[PDB]
Amino acid sequence: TSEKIASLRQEIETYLNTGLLPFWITRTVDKENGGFLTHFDQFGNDSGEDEKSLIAQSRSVFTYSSAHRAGYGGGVLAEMARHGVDYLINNMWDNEHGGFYWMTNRKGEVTIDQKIVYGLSFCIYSLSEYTLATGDPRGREYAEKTFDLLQKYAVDTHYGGYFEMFNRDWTLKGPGAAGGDRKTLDVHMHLMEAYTTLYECTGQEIHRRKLLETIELLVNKVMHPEYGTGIPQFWADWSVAPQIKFDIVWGWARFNPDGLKSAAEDNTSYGHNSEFAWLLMHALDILGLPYDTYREQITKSYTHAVENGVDWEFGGVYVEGSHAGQVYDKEKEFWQQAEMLIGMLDAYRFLKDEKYLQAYENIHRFVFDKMINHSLGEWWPLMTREGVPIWKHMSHSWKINYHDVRSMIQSIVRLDKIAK
Amino acid sequence: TSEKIASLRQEIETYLNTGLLPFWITRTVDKENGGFLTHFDQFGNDSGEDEKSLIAQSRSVFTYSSAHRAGYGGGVLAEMARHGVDYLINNMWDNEHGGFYWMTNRKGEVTIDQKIVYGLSFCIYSLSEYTLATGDPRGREYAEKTFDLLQKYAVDTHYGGYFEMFNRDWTLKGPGAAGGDRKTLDVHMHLMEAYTTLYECTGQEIHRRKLLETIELLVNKVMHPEYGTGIPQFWADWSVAPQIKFDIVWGWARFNPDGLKSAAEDNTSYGHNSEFAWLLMHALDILGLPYDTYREQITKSYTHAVENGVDWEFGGVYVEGSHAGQVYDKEKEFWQQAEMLIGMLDAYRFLKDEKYLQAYENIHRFVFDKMINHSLGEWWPLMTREGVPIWKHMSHSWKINYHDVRSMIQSIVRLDKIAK
Ligand SMILES: OC[C@@H](O)[C@@H](O)[C@H](O)[C@@H](O)CO
Numbered sequence: 151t152s153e154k155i156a157s158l159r160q161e162i163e164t165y166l167n168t169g170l171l172p173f174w175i176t177r178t179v180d181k182e183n184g185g186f187l188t189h190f191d192q193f194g195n196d197s198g199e200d201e202k203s204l205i206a207q208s209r210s211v212f213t214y215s216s217a218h219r220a221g222y223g224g225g226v227l228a229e230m231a232r233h234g235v236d237y238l239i240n241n242m243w244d245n246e247h248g249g250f251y252w253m254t255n256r257k258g259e260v261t262i263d264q265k266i267v268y269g270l271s272f273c274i275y276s277l278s279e280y281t282l283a284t285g286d287p288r289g290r291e292y293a294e295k296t297f298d299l300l301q302k303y304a305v306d307t308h309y310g311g312y313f314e315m316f317n318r319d320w321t322l323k324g325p326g327a328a329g330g331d332r333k334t335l336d337v338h339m340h341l342m343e344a345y346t347t348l349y350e351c352t353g354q355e356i357h358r359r360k361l362l363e364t365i366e367l368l369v370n371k372v373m374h375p376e377y378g379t380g381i382p383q384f385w386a387d388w389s390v391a392p393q394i395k396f397d398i399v400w401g402w403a404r405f406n407p408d409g410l411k412s413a414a415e416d417n418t419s420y421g422h423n424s425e426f427a428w429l430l431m432h433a434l435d436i437l438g439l440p441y442d443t444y445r446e447q448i449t450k451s452y453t454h455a456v457e458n459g460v461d462w463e464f465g466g467v468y469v470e471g472s473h474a475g476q477v478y479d480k481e482k483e484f485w486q487q488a489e490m491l492i493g494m495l496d497a498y499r500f501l502k503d504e505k506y507l508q509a510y511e512n513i514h515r516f517v518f519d520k521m522i523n524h525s526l527g528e529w530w531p532l533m534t535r536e537g538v539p540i541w542k543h544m545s546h547s548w549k550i551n552y553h554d555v556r557s558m559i560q561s562i563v564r565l566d567k568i569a570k
Numbered sequence: 571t572s573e574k575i576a577s578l579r580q581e582i583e584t585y586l587n588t589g590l591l592p593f594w595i596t597r598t599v600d601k602e603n604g605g606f607l608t609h610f611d612q613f614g615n616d617s618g619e620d621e622k623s624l625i626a627q628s629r630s631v632f633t634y635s636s637a638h639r640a641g642y643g644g645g646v647l648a649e650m651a652r653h654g655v656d657y658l659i660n661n662m663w664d665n666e667h668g669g670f671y672w673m674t675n676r677k678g679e680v681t682i683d684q685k686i687v688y689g690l691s692f693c694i695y696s697l698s699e700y701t702l703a704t705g706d707p708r709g710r711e712y713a714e715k716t717f718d719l720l721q722k723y724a725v726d727t728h729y730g731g732y733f734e735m736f737n738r739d740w741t742l743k744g745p746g747a748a749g750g751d752r753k754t755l756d757v758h759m760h761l762m763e764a765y766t767t768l769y770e771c772t773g774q775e776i777h778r779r780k781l782l783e784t785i786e787l788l789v790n791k792v793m794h795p796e797y798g799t800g801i802p803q804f805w806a807d808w809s810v811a812p813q814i815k816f817d818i819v820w821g822w823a824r825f826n827p828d829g830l831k832s833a834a835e836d837n838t839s840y841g842h843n844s845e846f847a848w849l850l851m852h853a854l855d856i857l858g859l860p861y862d863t864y865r866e867q868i869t870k871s872y873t874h875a876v877e878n879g880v881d882w883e884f885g886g887v888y889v890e891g892s893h894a895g896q897v898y899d900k901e902k903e904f905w906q907q908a909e910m911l912i913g914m915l916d917a918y919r920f921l922k923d924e925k926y927l928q929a930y931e932n933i934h935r936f937v938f939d940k941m942i943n944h945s946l947g948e949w950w951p952l953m954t955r956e957g958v959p960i961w962k963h964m965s966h967s968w969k970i971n972y973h974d975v976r977s978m979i980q981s982i983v984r985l986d987k988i989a990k
Pocket residue numbers: 336400401402425485548549553
């Protein structure tokens with residue numbers, strides 16, 4: 151219903167303009183040391199972490215670049231992005247070996263000099279988006295510099311794909327938790343997301359060809375060969391590896407005590423599969439290719455998410471479950487809802503089955519009625535199945551505004567497409 | 571027999587010092603335009619080709635660098651290499667897009683601006699060898715620059731391996747004869763040869779890891795999965811492609827009218843398989859790895875060459891034949907004899923079966939009694955099975971001194987190893 155679509159779009163528009171973006175605009179710009187402040191407790195007050203992670207600073211650069219480019223933030227977001235791009239190049243860029251450092255403290259000193267491809271993907275993503283929004287060639291320059299370093303040091307020229315964790319001097323890290331012997335869905339999915347904006351910015355044949363190569367890797371090696379769902383970790387030879395926690399992390403380790411099959415290695419994340427599918431669709435948009443170029447893959451990702459991840463009774467998407475169709479972890483974490491909002495919409499656009507629009511409204515209602523802490527404007531990071539926050543910290547080094555702002559803008563955009 | 575080994579080594583030493591190297595030292599240095607002259611007819615006189623191919627100039631740089639490093643040329647070869655490195659950077663290097671151009675005319679003007687990975691491999695090979703011989707960091711610098719450009723533009727991050735032919739702006743060339751849709755044994759074998767000297771020069775972890783990735787590609791995708799013999803051409807997905815002639819070439823197209831199974835697509839080159847095997851062994855030497863790291867592969871290459879390629883009656887190695895064991899083309903071309911000299915020696919070192927030393931003496935005797943034009947010092951390019959030159963041009967844009975000088979130095983070296 152156009153009245154229902156308009157109601158949903160307005161709910162997002164008011165919340166995005168008066169709640170979410172103001173939460174960050176009034177808090178994050180650090181004029182003393184440069185960069186952004188991203189550590190806020192359940193009362194919007196500083197938690198005091200002496201960290202400015204590459205993930206935090208780059209995602210902020212992306213959010214403010216993309217939101218300004220979309221027409222949000224009252225025009226002040228572009229200069230906020232430049233403030234962060236200033237911090238990235240001046241404090242986080244390695245002037246002897248290249249690439250962006252993983253971690254800095256509050257005053258700008260490098261504290262983890264490793265070159266993590268997961269963070270470097272977000273550098274390529276955010277700096278490409280930054281140049282697209284502001285025209286500053288510094289974004290594209292350092293994004294191209296990062297891409298070239300990934301080709302030189304990270305690309306496995308035999309098996310394909312990328313090695314994902316390196317020391318500061320770009321030497322491959324050790325095996326196991328050091329991160330030097332695994333190829334992961336986490337990194338390879340976001341490089342596809344990164345190369346999409348990179349190619350959109352530069353327009354080179356090389357960036358279009360490597361974006362397609364990244365899509366091919368995900369479809370042919372990363373996703374389940376039968377179910378099409380994302381498998382988290384692989385060996386270099388692309389056989390499935392046992393899932394491990396790397397020494398370098400970019401999230402809080404959450405164990406659901408009442409989760410099912412704790413040791414099961416066949417888990418897949420509905421939020422990841424939805425995030426991959428709509429990002430692949432957006433990649434096809436940027437590539438000028440039709441969606442059904444990967445109709446089998448896109449249909450597998452969305453069908454699996456809507457049939458197993460959507461909590462129809464309480465609302466929101468579950469954390470993870472088996473490829474076969476069993477739900478393992480029924481908790482409610484913030485980023486999977488964000489990615490499910492966009493995906494379920496794009497699923498409705500491509501597959502045209504109304505259970506996807508129902509799936510969107512289920513998750514839309516969950517985020518606005520349960521997840522959004524309206525007194526501050528940010529999202530609760532983790533919740534019991536029926537709502538009710540488990541963790542109440544509003545933001546940290548790994549939870550900023552990348553997922554929620556983009557999912558808000560992209561949802562108004564796709565909902566507008568559906569109404570027409 | 572040590573008396574037989576000494577006799578063979580001395581035959582090479584006298585010929586290398588008094589015949590082959592003097593042929594080039596007295597002819598090739600072009601002080602007017604820079605670079606090297608490589609076009610000489612059957613009387614050692616200029617043929618007048620208005621060409622200075624990247625293959626010609628780079629191979630010359632390698633020959634003079636490697637021979638000087640080995641202690642040959644009366645000490646004058648190092649400065650000859652620098653004269654060529656001067657020409658490569660000043661006349662053949664693309665200062666806007668990077669990489670070395672494919673073709674220049676006699677006076678140094680670029681005539682084919684394409685970036686051909688086959689030539690760029692020889693740039694990495696020769697410039698790495700040049701720095702190892704002279705200490706001039708320009709070789710290593712531009713060799714590393716070329717390697718990095720290959721990772722950025724040439725590496726297929728999905729299927730692995732390299733795309734092999736690009737326009738000047740590094741955009742992938744068209745399909746078919748343009749060379750943009752095939753991965754070939756020719757390029758991938760020599761990159762392994764190039765990355766070996768590159769890693770020997772720089773010592774970086776990245777060059778060691780990519781050299782191993784190159785070896786893995788050749789063993790697992792390029793060689794026959796059963797016979798282990800080299801298959802010339804593949805599609806990007808590494809399935810076997812029909813053999814074609816590219817618009818860019820680096821040799822004379824020779825059709826043997828009395829060759830067997832002219833249309834057979836199962837041909838393999840004994841010279842190539844031997845060249846790959848001893849170069850792989852040398853790569854293992856540089857990598858500090860034992861030969862039996864690829865014992866199955868190395869044994870397949872050498873056994874196939876000695877059992878099918880060695881002409882026991884007349885001497886020398888045939889041109890090509892089937893993987894299964896049938897000889898197709900019994901003519902005698904220069905570069906396959908050179909590579910068979912080194913390979914048959916290394917085969918004797920690793921496999922210790924005396925049929926390989928017999929194979930070496932068969933080819934040694936053929937080259938010195940039939941192929942070497944002793945009145946000038948260079949090798950006849952092509953011959954009937956029983957000797958007797960078919961083509962008598964001594965050198966051109968694709969036949970210089972890369973194969974024969976290296977095979978002469980490396981043969982004295984391995985023969986010296988056998989005697990001890
Ligand atoms: O796609 C990767 C995933 O979205 C992860 O990067 C989360 O953003 C992070 O766990 C937030 O804490």
